[PDB]
Amino acid sequence: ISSETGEMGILWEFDPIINKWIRLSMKLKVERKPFAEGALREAYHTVSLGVGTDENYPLGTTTKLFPPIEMISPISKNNEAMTQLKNGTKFVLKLYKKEAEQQASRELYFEAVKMQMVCRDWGNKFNQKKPPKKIEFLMSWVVELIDRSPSSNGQPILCSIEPLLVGEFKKNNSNYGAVLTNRSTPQAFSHFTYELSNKQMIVVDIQGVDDLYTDPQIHTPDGKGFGLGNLGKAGINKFITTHKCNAVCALLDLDVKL
Ligand SMILES: Nc1ncnc2c1ncn2[C@@H]1O[C@H](COP(=O)(O)O)[C@@H](O)[C@H]1O
Numbered sequence: 658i659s660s661e662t663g664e665m666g667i668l669w670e671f672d673p674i675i676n677k678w679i680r681l682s683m684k685l686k687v688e689r690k691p692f693a694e695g696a697l698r699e700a701y702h703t704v705s706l707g708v709g710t711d712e713n714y715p716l717g718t719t720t721k722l723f724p725p726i727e728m729i730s731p732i733s734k735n736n737e738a739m740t741q742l743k744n745g746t747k748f749v750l751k752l753y754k755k756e757a758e759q760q761a762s763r764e765l766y767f768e769a770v771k772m773q774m775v776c777r778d779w780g781n782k783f784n785q786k787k788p789p790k791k792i793e794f795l796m797s798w799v800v801e802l803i804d805r806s807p808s809s810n811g812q813p814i815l816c817s818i819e820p821l822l823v824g825e826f827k828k829n830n831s832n833y834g835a836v837l838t839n840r841s842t843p844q845a846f847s848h849f850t851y852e853l854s855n856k857q858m859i860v861v862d863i864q865g866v867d868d869l870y871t872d873p874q875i876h877t878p879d880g881k882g883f884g885l886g887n888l889g890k891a892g893i894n895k896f897i898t899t900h901k902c903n904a905v906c907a908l909l910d911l912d913v914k915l
Pocket residue numbers: 693694695696697698699700749751819820821822823826871872
């Protein structure tokens with residue numbers, strides 16, 4: 658943690674193989690104006706001023722705590738943040754637009770970051786089949802900007818952070834059936850997660866730079882979890898109407914009927 662001018666934050670990393678959250682702290686310097694925007698959020702350039710422990714900021718009460726205490730690792734010595742967010746790193750911070758900040762609760766920040774980590778595992782499962790192009794999803798973290806005056810409201814300011822992508826950012830499909838590029842690997846990764854999960858999930862909203870992807874969305878047949886972008890059977894079926902499995906689908910031996 659550098660003594661340089663910045664702001665403090667509580668840092669949250671999710672580890673799927675142990676299925677627990679890792680609680681940390683960091684200092685960061687955010688630019689005043691955003692450099693890009695989506696439908697719901699704005700993105701800011703940020704520089705890391707160091708990652709440390711959370712010893713100075715106790716959780717206090719177990720009751721009403723989210724995420725719950727049983728989902729929190731008691732040891733935080735190992736994590737991705739210490740290398741990928743080390744002092745000097747340039748990264749990206751994302752805030753919700755006001756409005757609709759009204760549709761962003763504390764649970765949805767953690768649910769969104771857990772969803773990206775889940776998609777990150779599917780990328781590794783995809784890469785084990787040795788496709789022509791390997792895909793990879795970026796890390797993602799929840800950060801509580803504790804130095805910023807709470808929404809009033811009375812809730813602290815939350816955000817998500819992730820590594821910086823350098824290059825042309827392109828969206829390949831949406832979360833409701835659009836096919837926006839001629840590339841085969843993004844659609845085939847979608848034709849892949851739906852079949853290999855036995856139709857329990859599909860990963861769409863495949864976007865990013867080259868084969869580094871971020872901000873995916875998951876549909877599940879019951880429509881539960883994975884945020885408000887989970888359109889259930891409708892989202893799954895909408896992908897099937899516009900999908901043509903391709904040479905990558907064929908190479909992965911996916912079923913041409915869905
Ligand atoms: N990791 C990233 N690195 C650089 N630019 C990004 C990144 N994520 C999102 N963006 C930009 O921010 C915009 C908003 O993305 P979204 O997160 O979908 O609202 C995108 O259209 C990109 O131009």
